[PDB]
Paper text:
Toxin EsaD secreted by some S. aureus strains through the type VII secretion system (T7SS) specifically kills those strains lacking the antitoxin EsaG. EsaD is a toxin secreted in a T7SS machinery-dependent manner by S. aureus. Here we report the structures of EsaG, the nuclease domain of EsaD and their complex, which together reveal an inhibition mechanism that relies on significant conformational change of the toxin. The major contribution of this study is the discovery of an inhibitory mechanism in the toxin-antitoxin module that is based on a significant structural deformation of the toxin, where the central β-sheet of the nuclease domain of EsaD is split by EsaG into two fragments.
To investigate whether EsaG contains an IDR domain as most of the other type II antitoxins, we determined the crystal structure of full-length EsaG at a resolution of 2.30 Ǻ. There are two EsaG molecules in the asymmetric unit, which interact with each other in a 2-fold symmetry. Even though gel-filtration experiments indicated a dimer state, chemical cross-linking of EsaG using an amine-specific crosslinking reagent EGS (ethylene glycol bis(succinimidyl succinate)) yielded no cross-linked product. Density gradient centrifugation analysis also supported a monomer form. The structure of EsaG contains a principle four-stranded β-sheet sandwiched by αA’, αB’ and αC’ from one side and αD’ and αE’ from the other side. We noticed that, except for three residues (G50–S51 on loopβ2’-αB’ and E162 on the C-terminus), electron densities were observed for all the other residues of EsaG. Similarly, BH3703 is also well structured with only three residues in the C-terminus missing. This suggests the absence of IDRs in EsaG-like antitoxins and, therefore, a distinct toxin inhibition mechanism in Gram-positive bacteria. Except for subtle movements in some loops, no obvious conformational change happens on EsaG upon EsaDc binding, further supporting the absence of IDR in the inhibition process. In contrast, we didn’t observe any disorder-to-order conversion of the antitoxin EsaG in the structures of EsaG and EsaDc-EsaG complex.
Numbering used by the authors: 1 to 49, 52 to 161
Write the structure that this text describes.
């Protein structure tokens, strides 16, 4: 199996997982995974046939138990971590972030970024809010968070 085949297998597994975590019909799906040496996290938003829907709200609104959803969540994270370990296994610079987007109409985008988030000294919420501001046009709901988004913006501009 080549590198492309490994990437493809993992991508397919990821897509199937994320689709399995959504109990209803979805239109667009935006997934983000921040993984470095100091742990990491995975989150995704999904639209319905528009408004973004945050993944951790799925068990609250729909009939899927917290336990099952959290299990599938952990499996997804494990998939992304395996994806990074592949990059390591092929003597490539390990990515620090991965965007995994796909739509109901077959659109697909997988991209990697290598921002040194550790030395940025910003936490997961800052990274998430900044991501939501960059990808979409959504700004946070408190001035503290907004200010942090500006700080991260300026940190990145100075790279």
């Amino acid at each position: 199996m080549t590198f492309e085949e490994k990437l493809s297998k993992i991508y397919n597994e990821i897509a199937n997982e994320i689709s399995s975590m959504i109990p209803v019909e979805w239109e667009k799906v935006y997934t983000m995974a921040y993984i470095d040496d100091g742990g990491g996290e995975v989150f995704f938003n999904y639209t319905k046939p528009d408004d973004l829907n945050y993944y951790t709200n799925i068990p609250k609104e729909y009939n899927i138990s917290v336990q099952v959803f959290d299990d599938l969540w952990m499996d997804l994270y494990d998939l992304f971590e395996e994806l990074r370990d592949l990059f390591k296994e092929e003597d490539l610079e390990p990515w620090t972030s991965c965007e995994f987007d796909f739509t109901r109409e077959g659109e697909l985008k997988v991209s990697f970024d290598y921002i040194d988030w550790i030395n940025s000294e910003f936490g997961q919420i800052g990274r998430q809010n900044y991501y939501k501001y960059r990808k979409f046009g959504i700004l946070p709901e408190t001035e503290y968070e907004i200010n942090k988004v500006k700080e991260i913006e300026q940190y990145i501009k100075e790279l």
